[PDB]
From Swiss-Prot, chains A, B:
GO terms for molecular function: monooxygenase activity; nucleotide binding. Belongs to the flavin-dependent halogenase family. Bacterial tryptophan halogenase subfamily. Its EC number is 1.14.19.9. 7-chloro-L-tryptophan binds at residues 78, 345, 442-443, 449, 453. The keyword Flavoprotein applies. The reaction between FADH(2), Cl(-) and O(2) produces hypochlorous acid (HOCl), a powerful oxidant. Unlike the mechanism proposed for the tryptophan 7-halogenase RebH (AC Q8KHZ8), which suggests the formation of a chloramine intermediate with a conserved lysine, HOCl is proposed to be a direct halogenation reagent, with the conserved lysine that may hydrogen bond to HOCl to enhance the electrophilicity of the chlorine species and for its correct positioning for incorporation into the 7-position. The lineage of its organism: Bacteria, Pseudomonadati, Pseudomonadota, Gammaproteobacteria, Pseudomonadales. The gene is prnA. It comes from Pseudomonas fluorescens. Homodimer. FAD binds at residues 12, 14-15, 38, 41, 44, 48-49, 186, 336, 349. This is Tryptophan 7-halogenase PrnA. Signal peptide: none annotated.
Amino acid sequence: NKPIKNIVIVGGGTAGWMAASYLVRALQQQANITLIESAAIPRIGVGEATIPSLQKVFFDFLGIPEREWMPQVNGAFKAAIKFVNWRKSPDPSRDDHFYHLFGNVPNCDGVPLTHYWLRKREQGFQQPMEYACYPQPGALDGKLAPCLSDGTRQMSHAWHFDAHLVADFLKRWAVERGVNRVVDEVVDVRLNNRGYISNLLTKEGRTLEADLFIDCSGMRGLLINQALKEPFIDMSDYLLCDSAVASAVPNDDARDGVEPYTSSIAMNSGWTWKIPMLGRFGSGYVFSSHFTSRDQATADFLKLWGLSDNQPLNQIKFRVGRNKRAWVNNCVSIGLSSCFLEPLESTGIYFIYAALYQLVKHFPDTSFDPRLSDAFNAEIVHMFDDCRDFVQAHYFTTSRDDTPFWLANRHDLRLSDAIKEKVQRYKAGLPLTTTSFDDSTYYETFDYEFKNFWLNGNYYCIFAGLGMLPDRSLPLLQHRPESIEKAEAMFASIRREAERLRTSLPTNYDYLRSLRD
Amino acid sequence: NKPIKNIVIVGGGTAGWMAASYLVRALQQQANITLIESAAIPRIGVGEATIPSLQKVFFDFLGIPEREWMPQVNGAFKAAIKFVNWRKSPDPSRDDHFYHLFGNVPNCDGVPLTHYWLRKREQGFQQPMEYACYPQPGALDGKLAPCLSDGTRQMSHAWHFDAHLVADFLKRWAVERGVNRVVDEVVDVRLNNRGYISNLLTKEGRTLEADLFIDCSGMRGLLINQALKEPFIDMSDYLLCDSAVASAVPNDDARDGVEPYTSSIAMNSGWTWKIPMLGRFGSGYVFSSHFTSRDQATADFLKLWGLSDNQPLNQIKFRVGRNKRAWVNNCVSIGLSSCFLEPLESTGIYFIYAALYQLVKHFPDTSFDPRLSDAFNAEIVHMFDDCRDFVQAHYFTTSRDDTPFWLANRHDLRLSDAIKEKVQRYKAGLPLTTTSFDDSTYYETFDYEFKNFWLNGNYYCIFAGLGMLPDRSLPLLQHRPESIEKAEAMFASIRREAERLRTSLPTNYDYLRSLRD
Ligand SMILES: Cc1cc2nc3c(=O)[nH]c(=O)nc-3n(C[C@H](O)[C@H](O)[C@H](O)COP(=O)(O)OP(=O)(O)OC[C@H]3O[C@@H](n4cnc5c(N)ncnc54)[C@H](O)[C@@H]3O)c2cc1C
Ligand SMILES: Cc1cc2nc3c(=O)[nH]c(=O)nc-3n(C[C@H](O)[C@H](O)[C@H](O)COP(=O)(O)OP(=O)(O)OC[C@H]3O[C@@H](n4cnc5c(N)ncnc54)[C@H](O)[C@@H]3O)c2cc1C
Ligand SMILES: [Cl-]
Ligand SMILES: [Cl-]
């Protein structure tokens, strides 16, 4: 069969430019790549939070080290997500926060430390799970950097940045490597009688042809949904939010520091993200229009940050769910054209580069063997539905009951068999998937991470944070007092590490400034 | 105009029940009082320290003598606050304590004894000011009662008690006098187009109406802040603490006695209170989250009292400051809904009964003449800001420099013109406000005390305790050697009184037991 040679990508947002750059890098020879993007149709860049695989899977593949790309996108460091007021109805006299940390929890004699922590908790131990089982959360409370001043990594981290600047950085990178950029708008899509895309007609009268089309057109799914009519599986029965109101809010970094984490602050009818950078934070109240009006959500969002009625707001809507198939005929959807999940666990850009990684791992010829696209499609379904369920488990596990929105989350969601089953195992006291690898090894082994994305520690941070604990500790531990003692030595190491970090890390603000103000 | 007849109080904490009982007592006729309080929303009762006006302004007004209410709240006696390690960086080989005593310092020929003490100090006199100028602090060192065994008062005193039990005692008292108690939760507040409160909708579907609403909902300010949108003036530029971690700690009263005073033990990033009762003391490390994590503060608090990781802790947060106005339209805020100051000088419950006293002194009709609420509001601003400044003067005057927290207190606070001016006068050697009245007369004349709350002796105990003394004694004294001699006879009387107290007072523990174990 003849190789795919000509590739057209529709869209110049984060997806389009990630696709152009991943493909120009992967397809060393016999690749002619053209990206078309409209000047009149905006790109989504709200100020975005990410996960460590962005470097290991994406930028490493491009041969771009963190020190090269991060400054160019005015990036800031992210070590966790901090959930605020998710556990109980807000009470201003109570501190309700918990962290979902990067990295994984060690094991002691084949049992994760989370499980030893629960046994201690049964015996009266008061310290929250994540402060017992991870070295860094108090450092995050202190707004400390994830590295020593000399750049020595001290905890797993990812990034906050304006995604517009990342798209810009990759545009520059990809065009320099021979990607053809066309600023123009696709107005019609012509399919042959077999339903493959034949060509694109543009506003300026160009006709684009290709062996392979990548739909990066955003939520409209110009090629995959509009032209090819692939059904979108609306998952609003699983997750209720469908809206956001967002802005950036000036931060006095010198007085207030720069939080080294994303926050998720639970509201009456959704939750607000906070994504710190230098000089400002991005923020958006993600809400369900069925439980609050945009006007009310807007008022709440303003009141939260003490913002004025003159502050310009980005009014957003979305549909949660995914295409029935991501790749149909000669068109692969990547990004918001493929699927959408609310940003509760920073998976949006992940879905872009994970999809790109799988596209190359299933890369077609011009015969478009349906076995390759079937395999790709099943990976995407697994990836998305797994994240959907993990995000949903934040909602149905809360015990907030103060608004109709929280009550509906507790009672009225449709839950997959897969999540029900994971919760059953957790509640029984069983570990969920654990890794034996160091954090470095886990984040360097993407076929492993892709399939084992959410581990025991990820679920524990969420369930324990929300005050939903297993029925009991593992019966096995009653038979292994020496293992319980060994675990105590591990908790002691972790506490030592936390105290060393306290007095060794620069503030996040100082470290960011030293990289370049 | 028609009288206010129907009054609804939201909240059943100390504020709500003080409000119900003060109002049912004051409003002898034409008063229908209903208090609504949620069973699902806790009340603040940490183990609370108070000041002598609680009896003179509050319980006396109700016609309840100390001997009636104190036993019912398992109260213990308080004669002072003892500040530990506030003056210098802690050194375990140095005794760093001083007392802020109740009562006032006498005058000698129109000059307070503090000023004669400073002149002696200039000449080499070693004894600390408060041990020279007050008869009782050595008795407090000896853990002695504030009364003889027969109940004869021997020094000014107030009380330590669990405030839950006081709320309970007043609930009983007020309900017996016709207050209507509703256990239910307000879920919505309806305002008319003019912005007055029209009604309250409750979880159980009741609609509460009233001529006058008293917001005792705690820090959330359900009516005043949430419904009526009155701005809260955040005063975190004035005072840094925003958090506490608290518990009760068993006391072996038979071996260790029961301290007849509250202690304030300065920590790395805040201070710890100690509030003795029979069998236990309440304690809380008040801290600034900007300088320490809750997890670190918790560890420090545990280490301080040798407490175990199984000890249940009350994790508290707060915002220092006050509403811009306490009374808006038909809603008066009282208690934590109105304002908050850290418990450094035991003013929390004071603000409740002082506000109630002023409400009755400015009591409206249904026309809600804004001149009455304006006058009330200005009294509350004066009351709060004056206490804020007095508390703040503990912080900016210390010479501790051992932690970022103490350095920020020394250098980075915003200070009112009023406090700057008082400090200027003190430093110049001038008396601050003095009274000619006996302690009894001062504490029986509340319009006087309310406006002249902190006197020369109060400021001297703090500034002298912190090692910040005036530049010089009063130039006038160089012209009055006979007055200096008369003052010597007064110091001699005080010393005699201290020695008589030594051998005449029962221990606080024995006296408390004799009242009823
Ligand atoms: C509220 C919200 C919050 C988010 N938060 C995060 C987060 O915290 N972390 C994270 O990783 N991700 C997050 N995401 C996801 C992330 O913003 C986007 O997925 C990502 O930035 C890229 O989207 P995209 O490129 O597929 O689409 P878009 O940004 O919508 O870009 C679409 C491109 O297609 C072009 N286009 C459309 N139609 C035509 C046409 N007919 N002809 C020519 N060009 C066309 C447009 O001009 C544009 O260039 C969030 C998303 C939303 C909506
Ligand atoms: C850490 C700390 C230390 C302190 N130390 C001292 C001290 O040493 N000395 C001192 O004098 N004071 C002290 N105080 C102040 C004192 O504890 C409180 O001011 C006082 O006990 C009463 O508070 P409150 O009644 O206004 O609010 P809360 O105790 O918070 O009670 C609020 C009431 O409102 C009800 N409520 C709230 N929302 C609703 C709703 N929507 N519907 C129905 N009911 C509702 C709740 O159920 C509750 O009954 C301290 C305070 C703190 C936080
Ligand atoms: Cl996302
Ligand atoms: Cl107080």
